[PDB]
Amino acid sequence: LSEQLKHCNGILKELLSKKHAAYAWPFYKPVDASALGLHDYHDIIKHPMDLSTVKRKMENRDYRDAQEFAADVRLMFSNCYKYNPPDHDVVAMARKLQDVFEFRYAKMPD
Numbered sequence: 001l002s003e004q005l006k007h008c009n010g011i012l013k014e015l016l017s018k019k020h021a022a023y024a025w026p027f028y029k030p031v032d033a034s035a036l037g038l039h040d041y042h043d044i045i046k047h048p049m050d051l052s053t054v055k056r057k058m059e060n061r062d063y064r065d066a067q068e069f070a071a072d073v074r075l076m077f078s079n080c081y082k083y084n085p086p087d088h089d090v091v092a093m094a095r096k097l098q099d100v101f102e103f104r105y106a107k108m109p110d
């Protein structure tokens with residue numbers, strides 16, 4: 001990985017770390033719409049994304065730059081904000097994990 005992609009991988013490891021598990025866990029794996037009874041999920045969310053998918057893409061050297069990695073992380077949060085009512089606990093959790101992401105992503109090495 002390039003320097004910027006190592007910074008992205010560091011962020012990814014932090015997002016998956018025990019430090020943030022209390023609010024990161026809804027984003028660890030793909031939303032299982034059928035299991036959760038969310039039968040409209042895939043009609044509203046056209047491009048599902050989660051941290052396990054981001055990790056697989058990083059491991060596969062799919063991301064060619066930091067911007068591509070950040071786009072998937074933000075897509076994951078955006079899906080949450082689109083589907084979920086703003087007062088659901090999952091939205092509060094998304095906001096908290098996005099704050100961790102955005103503040104560390106901003107410290108990207110030049």
Ligand SMILES: CNC(=O)c1cc(C(=O)N[C@H]2[C@@H]3COC[C@@H]32)cc2c1OC[C@@]2(C)c1ccccc1
Pocket residue numbers: 026027031036038080083084085088089090093
């Ligand atoms: C990314 N995860 C989700 O969007 C998600 C979505 C829902 C969910 O049921 N959304 C429904 C919208 C539309 O109708 C009401 C709201 C539930 C969960 C999710 O994650 C994990 C889980 C199980 C959870 C999370 C935090 C607290 C408790 C339970």
